[PDB]
Motif scaffolding. Sequence first.
Motif, PDB file in Angstrom:
ATOM      1  N   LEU B  57      -3.096  23.975 -26.491  1.00 43.44           N
ATOM      2  CA  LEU B  57      -4.475  23.793 -26.057  1.00 43.44           C
ATOM      3  C   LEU B  57      -4.592  23.855 -24.542  1.00 43.44           C
ATOM      4  O   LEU B  57      -5.650  24.201 -24.007  1.00 43.44           O
ATOM      5  CB  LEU B  57      -5.012  22.463 -26.578  1.00 43.44           C
ATOM      6  CG  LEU B  57      -5.007  22.281 -28.094  1.00 43.44           C
ATOM      7  CD1 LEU B  57      -5.789  21.040 -28.487  1.00 43.44           C
ATOM      8  CD2 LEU B  57      -5.563  23.516 -28.777  1.00 43.44           C
ATOM      9  N   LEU B  58      -3.521  23.512 -23.835  1.00 44.92           N
ATOM     10  CA  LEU B  58      -3.568  23.468 -22.382  1.00 44.92           C
ATOM     11  C   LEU B  58      -3.356  24.865 -21.814  1.00 44.92           C
ATOM     12  O   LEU B  58      -2.493  25.613 -22.281  1.00 44.92           O
ATOM     13  CB  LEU B  58      -2.502  22.509 -21.856  1.00 44.92           C
ATOM     14  CG  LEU B  58      -2.784  21.755 -20.556  1.00 44.92           C
ATOM     15  CD1 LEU B  58      -1.806  20.605 -20.398  1.00 44.92           C
ATOM     16  CD2 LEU B  58      -2.749  22.663 -19.352  1.00 44.92           C
ATOM     17  N   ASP B  59      -4.145  25.216 -20.802  1.00 41.45           N
ATOM     18  CA  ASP B  59      -3.985  26.494 -20.118  1.00 41.45           C
ATOM     19  C   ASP B  59      -2.731  26.444 -19.257  1.00 41.45           C
ATOM     20  O   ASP B  59      -2.704  25.770 -18.223  1.00 41.45           O
ATOM     21  CB  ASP B  59      -5.218  26.794 -19.273  1.00 41.45           C
ATOM     22  CG  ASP B  59      -5.310  28.248 -18.874  1.00 41.45           C
ATOM     23  OD1 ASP B  59      -4.413  29.028 -19.253  1.00 41.45           O
ATOM     24  OD2 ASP B  59      -6.279  28.613 -18.179  1.00 41.45           O
ATOM     25  N   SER B  60      -1.685  27.157 -19.683  1.00 41.21           N
ATOM     26  CA  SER B  60      -0.413  27.117 -18.972  1.00 41.21           C
ATOM     27  C   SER B  60      -0.506  27.712 -17.575  1.00 41.21           C
ATOM     28  O   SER B  60       0.349  27.419 -16.732  1.00 41.21           O
ATOM     29  CB  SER B  60       0.658  27.849 -19.781  1.00 41.21           C
ATOM     30  OG  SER B  60       0.102  28.946 -20.485  1.00 41.21           O
ATOM     31  N   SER B  61      -1.519  28.537 -17.306  1.00 38.18           N
ATOM     32  CA  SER B  61      -1.684  29.094 -15.971  1.00 38.18           C
ATOM     33  C   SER B  61      -2.124  28.046 -14.958  1.00 38.18           C
ATOM     34  O   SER B  61      -2.017  28.287 -13.752  1.00 38.18           O
ATOM     35  CB  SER B  61      -2.691  30.244 -15.998  1.00 38.18           C
ATOM     36  OG  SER B  61      -3.853  29.887 -16.723  1.00 38.18           O
ATOM     37  N   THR B  62      -2.617  26.897 -15.418  1.00 40.41           N
ATOM     38  CA  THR B  62      -3.079  25.848 -14.520  1.00 40.41           C
ATOM     39  C   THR B  62      -2.044  24.759 -14.280  1.00 40.41           C
ATOM     40  O   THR B  62      -2.198  23.984 -13.331  1.00 40.41           O
ATOM     41  CB  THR B  62      -4.360  25.210 -15.067  1.00 40.41           C
ATOM     42  OG1 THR B  62      -4.104  24.652 -16.361  1.00 40.41           O
ATOM     43  CG2 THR B  62      -5.463  26.249 -15.175  1.00 40.41           C
ATOM     44  N   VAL B  63      -1.002  24.678 -15.105  1.00 44.43           N
ATOM     45  CA  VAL B  63       0.088  23.742 -14.859  1.00 44.43           C
ATOM     46  C   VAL B  63       1.017  24.356 -13.827  1.00 44.43           C
ATOM     47  O   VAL B  63       1.917  25.130 -14.166  1.00 44.43           O
ATOM     48  CB  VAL B  63       0.857  23.395 -16.145  1.00 44.43           C
ATOM     49  CG1 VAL B  63       1.935  22.364 -15.851  1.00 44.43           C
ATOM     50  CG2 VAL B  63      -0.082  22.871 -17.189  1.00 44.43           C
ATOM     51  N   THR B  81       0.512  13.733 -10.350  1.00 44.53           N
ATOM     52  CA  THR B  81      -0.197  14.991 -10.147  1.00 44.53           C
ATOM     53  C   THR B  81      -1.394  14.809  -9.225  1.00 44.53           C
ATOM     54  O   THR B  81      -1.643  15.643  -8.347  1.00 44.53           O
ATOM     55  CB  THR B  81      -0.640  15.569 -11.491  1.00 44.53           C
ATOM     56  OG1 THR B  81       0.365  15.311 -12.478  1.00 44.53           O
ATOM     57  CG2 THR B  81      -0.858  17.069 -11.377  1.00 44.53           C
ATOM     58  N   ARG B  85      -1.850  16.639  -5.393  1.00 39.94           N
ATOM     59  CA  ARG B  85      -2.921  17.531  -4.957  1.00 39.94           C
ATOM     60  C   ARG B  85      -3.535  17.056  -3.646  1.00 39.94           C
ATOM     61  O   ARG B  85      -3.907  17.872  -2.795  1.00 39.94           O
ATOM     62  CB  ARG B  85      -3.993  17.636  -6.039  1.00 39.94           C
ATOM     63  CG  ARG B  85      -3.490  18.070  -7.402  1.00 39.94           C
ATOM     64  CD  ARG B  85      -3.676  19.562  -7.616  1.00 39.94           C
ATOM     65  NE  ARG B  85      -2.824  20.070  -8.685  1.00 39.94           N
ATOM     66  CZ  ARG B  85      -3.051  19.886  -9.978  1.00 39.94           C
ATOM     67  NH1 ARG B  85      -4.105  19.213 -10.408  1.00 39.94           N
ATOM     68  NH2 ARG B  85      -2.198  20.392 -10.865  1.00 39.94           N
TER      69      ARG B  85
ATOM     70  N   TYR F 145     -12.058  22.917 -17.538  1.00 37.13           N
ATOM     71  CA  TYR F 145     -11.216  21.971 -16.819  1.00 37.13           C
ATOM     72  C   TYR F 145     -11.608  20.558 -17.216  1.00 37.13           C
ATOM     73  O   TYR F 145     -12.797  20.252 -17.337  1.00 37.13           O
ATOM     74  CB  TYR F 145     -11.350  22.149 -15.304  1.00 37.13           C
ATOM     75  CG  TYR F 145     -10.696  23.401 -14.775  1.00 37.13           C
ATOM     76  CD1 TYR F 145      -9.474  23.348 -14.125  1.00 37.13           C
ATOM     77  CD2 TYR F 145     -11.300  24.638 -14.927  1.00 37.13           C
ATOM     78  CE1 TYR F 145      -8.874  24.491 -13.642  1.00 37.13           C
ATOM     79  CE2 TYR F 145     -10.707  25.784 -14.448  1.00 37.13           C
ATOM     80  CZ  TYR F 145      -9.495  25.706 -13.806  1.00 37.13           C
ATOM     81  OH  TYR F 145      -8.900  26.848 -13.325  1.00 37.13           O
ATOM     82  N   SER F 153      -6.588  17.192 -12.838  1.00 32.96           N
ATOM     83  CA  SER F 153      -7.400  18.273 -13.380  1.00 32.96           C
ATOM     84  C   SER F 153      -6.486  19.391 -13.857  1.00 32.96           C
ATOM     85  O   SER F 153      -5.730  19.961 -13.062  1.00 32.96           O
ATOM     86  CB  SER F 153      -8.385  18.792 -12.335  1.00 32.96           C
ATOM     87  OG  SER F 153      -7.735  19.629 -11.396  1.00 32.96           O
ATOM     88  N   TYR F 154      -6.559  19.703 -15.147  1.00 31.95           N
ATOM     89  CA  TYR F 154      -5.847  20.827 -15.732  1.00 31.95           C
ATOM     90  C   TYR F 154      -6.841  21.725 -16.447  1.00 31.95           C
ATOM     91  O   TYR F 154      -7.851  21.249 -16.973  1.00 31.95           O
ATOM     92  CB  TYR F 154      -4.770  20.371 -16.725  1.00 31.95           C
ATOM     93  CG  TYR F 154      -3.537  19.763 -16.099  1.00 31.95           C
ATOM     94  CD1 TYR F 154      -2.802  20.455 -15.151  1.00 31.95           C
ATOM     95  CD2 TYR F 154      -3.093  18.506 -16.480  1.00 31.95           C
ATOM     96  CE1 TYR F 154      -1.671  19.906 -14.584  1.00 31.95           C
ATOM     97  CE2 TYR F 154      -1.962  17.950 -15.921  1.00 31.95           C
ATOM     98  CZ  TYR F 154      -1.256  18.655 -14.973  1.00 31.95           C
ATOM     99  OH  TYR F 154      -0.128  18.103 -14.414  1.00 31.95           O
ATOM    100  N   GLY F 155      -6.562  23.024 -16.453  1.00 29.45           N
ATOM    101  CA  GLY F 155      -7.332  23.930 -17.277  1.00 29.45           C
ATOM    102  C   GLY F 155      -6.956  23.798 -18.740  1.00 29.45           C
ATOM    103  O   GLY F 155      -5.837  23.423 -19.089  1.00 29.45           O
TER     104      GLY F 155
END
Lengths: 136, 242, 208, 69, 230, 240, 38
Positions: B57-63, B81, B85, F145, F153-155
């Motif tokens: 479910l998680l967008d791996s491009s954002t991790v 995390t 940031r 997000y 914050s993660y996508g």
Amino acid sequence: EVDYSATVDQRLPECAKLAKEGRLQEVIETLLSLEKQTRTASDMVSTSRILVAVVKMCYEAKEWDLLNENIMLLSKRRSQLKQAVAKMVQQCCTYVEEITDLPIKLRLIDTLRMVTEGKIYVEIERARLTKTLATI
Amino acid sequence: GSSAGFDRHITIFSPEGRLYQVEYAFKAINQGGLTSVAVRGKDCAVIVTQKKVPDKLLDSSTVTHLFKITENIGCVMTGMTADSRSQVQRARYEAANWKYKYGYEIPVDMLCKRIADISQVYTQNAEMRPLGCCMILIGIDEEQGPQVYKCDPAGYYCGFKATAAGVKQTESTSFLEKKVKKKFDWTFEQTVETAITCLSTVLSIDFKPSEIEVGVVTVENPKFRILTEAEIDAHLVALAER
Amino acid sequence: AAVVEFQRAQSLLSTDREASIDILHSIVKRDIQENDEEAVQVKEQSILELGSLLAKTGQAAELGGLLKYVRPFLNSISKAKAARLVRSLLDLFLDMEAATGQEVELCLECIEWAKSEKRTFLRQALEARLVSLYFDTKRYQEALHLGSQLLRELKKMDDKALLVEVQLLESKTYHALSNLPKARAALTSARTTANAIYCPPKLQATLD
Amino acid sequence: SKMNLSEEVDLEDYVARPDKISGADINSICQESGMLAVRENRYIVLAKDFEKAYKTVIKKDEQEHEFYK
Amino acid sequence: GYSFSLTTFSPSGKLVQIEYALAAVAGGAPSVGIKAANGVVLATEKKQKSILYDERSVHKVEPITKHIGLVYSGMGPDYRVLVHRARKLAQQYYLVYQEPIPTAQLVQRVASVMQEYTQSGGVRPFGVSLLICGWNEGRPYLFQSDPSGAYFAWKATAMGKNYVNGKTFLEKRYNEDLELEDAIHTAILTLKESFEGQMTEDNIEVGICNEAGFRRLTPTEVKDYLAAIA
Amino acid sequence: TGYDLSASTFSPDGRVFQVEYAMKAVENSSTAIGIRCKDGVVFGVEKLVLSKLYEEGSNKRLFNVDRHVGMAVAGLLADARSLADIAREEASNFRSNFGYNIPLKHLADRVAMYVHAYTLYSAVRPFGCSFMLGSYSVNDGAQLYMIDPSGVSYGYWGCAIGKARQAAKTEIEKLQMKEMTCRDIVKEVAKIIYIVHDEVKDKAFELELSWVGELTNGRHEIVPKDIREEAEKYAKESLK
Amino acid sequence: AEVKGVCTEAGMYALRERRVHVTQEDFEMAVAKVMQKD
């Protein structure tokens, strides 16, 4: 495991012919690659045949420099099987008795006694080579 | 481990001269469960960290714990995390401010030295907590060459030929210590390989080209780039075949 | 330039030692410009490597004459490098047991350099070595006089490790003069001083 | 002295380490050094066995942060 | 931020937080300072826990002006805050008077900053002691700034771990007629007693001040001085 | 023990408990799910009615922080509303400075840093709400997000915030969201919310639906009642 | 107590040499051990 067996039964005679034709530096690289597949596969019998094979090629071709370099190299490979190295040294110490040229025999003895140093599985051989070195 | 008053709750000294709150911020680096490894070669610097995507479910491009602080400077963040940031945004601001005020790109040593200075104030003022994050910068200097700098919650910072921060920092330090003792000026391929190997040997994962992020800076191209999954696969294939 | 010859001298090390000696000498006799940060580094390195070779060849005129020849040179390099240079060359000559007869001369010359440069700690070590040279040359009366001055100076600065050696030399000097009462008294002081510190195994053996 | 060491083993490398270790620790280091040699079907302890044995036996977590000094 | 003092008087009339800050100084790496006849030497134990650290990346002996240098014993990050403040204070002195700041003036200005964090609201005292060395009016200067803000003029002193023993070592090994090179020798000897392991040219940092100004000795130079020890 | 009363105090294990306690406020709220499909993002909120005295539309957990960005919230509604205006004022300032609609990645990164800034000092408390921001554009594409009280914050391709977050995530995983469209997903979002709702527990919920995609020309809007009721019938039918 | 310990150590030093009578050397060597070493 994934025992190669007949795989080396196909290459080894083919490599035997190419060695006689003159191609040795290329085939040992081919057999080094084949040894790597077998050693990683933990194929005791197949890896033993390759190590015994390569030393025969460098013996029959009188490649004394290549034989000593190979003996050092194939003994130092990563996670080398102890029984396969034993067969190589057992087959190599036979070549010691056959060789009559003293400087060539001594260098092979020094090389072989160095790859057998501190190792239990080849402690009988290094003893016999130490006895052989003493008599010379 | 004596205590007297609020020496465990605010950044004030213990009877033996210890800042427990600052020490507790170090344990927050291990809260994320990730290990980052940075190795510096003769002409390149590589930061490698493991990426974990627990669910599809998680967008791996954002991790991503690899952040492009500047065109020529990149960092790997380990720890909380959210705090990571904040440091990256602050580091980007200082890098931009340095370029505006001084006219040349900020040196890597001065970038964390400011971040280490920023994080030191948190260790003296009791109104704020230290950021539970560790920052590892890599960049090619004009003269000093490749640089690797870690940037701890306490404001400590140093140059490193090979550093690591996270859960497996001490186990990866020993592996890198053994490799640097061999005294080999590694090429770009070796440095990536020893960076990937260090993370792989300590975690025992046998990485796929989707579980680690690799960021490199080279002398020939002094720009920070994230290696693509295909590019990481090339090193993983090369490492496996040897 | 001169750096290539250093590798050539290094290459000639496997060959005859005297063969490399010419290469190192030429750098040593080579004159230098104002600073030459590379050349003086090679010139100092050659002089240390040349003297090390002479410790095996055993050439007093080339080793003893080296120290006497390079006194003008020591005013160019840093004081720490010059002091390390005097100590290294002078130690090599005296570790060479060959009694050339001038050992007390250039050792006194070194002490005069130490006094000129106000290197106190360097002078004390040479003086303690000079006392040993005096005992080995049978200048017993001079050995005691120099040692007595050294004993007071080492006592003030609490240099116990060096102190024990001087008292032992005084003990050995009196014993050679067939003065057992004064040899035992000097040995008593050395043992007491040694008991106050940790003795390296060489110093304990000499005391025992 | 009771162990078949190789001439390549320099004991000063592990003696000079700043780790505050006891005789039982030193005995364990040598004991595990022969453990690795036995595992590899060897009878001579090389330097690599001592390096691995020292690391395993000590296993000292840092426990000290650099910013304190 | 908090507007109340975090340092207060104990019933026994002691600033307990200041004493705890001094306890951090006693846990820092040893720092030795010697004021010889012709200069001052500053030496410290710059020892890393692994080779992976770049020794030359961060320096413990940091210049403030062309003639004033700092060495600390205590918390690394806090020393950098005082280094920046000392350099800022040295500049603020320079723009107004157009003259290099005297050593005694910088210590007073820096020690005032240290005292503030022992009285200001919501801040803890600096956990470092500063050894300030300088050259003014043709005379060497050596000062020590404790976490409380008190500055002492030392002929020779040692701080950090095993500082009590190092101080007594200097009492029996220091004389006013000592020269700068012998001061470096005495400084390295002072570090040696508290030193564990072996002292290379990279694990110690030595800085000297003379008429030519303050400079930090390069590792090559420290090697020559170290060779005289053994 | 005193290690959990301030956000500026670390636990000996290096955990800020005040932030973690704010996480628990979100886990006590009703479930909100968001699914990023091929051509947009669809938001679904299980909106319980605490009493029949509330009008249909009270306590809207679906906000419009920009003309192209939506917001589904969970936790403290007052903090959720406050974070909505922070997102609204962040989006407004972005357009007033750079001249284009705020990228959702930057909007998420900007609001999350505001959320993170309340997790460091004892003078403020961490926000007790977790929210999801969803946006669509022709260039950037559908993005989703989720920002938590800690400031992380993660996508996402599909996310759930609330007490049935774990149960809803299992239902979202069965979907092939990367291939189906918003029209097919609004029915699915309705089905998942109905599946995770507990009738024996707190009951009488209202399906709040919103979407942004190419069918709304990159504009976040409430799903029209006709489509919302159609999905509701499908969701009720899926329960047999 | 340190003074007393010097005496008892001086008697030890005579025993290390298998002597019967404690000499002045023993007291001096006992002084160095008790104070300087410890």
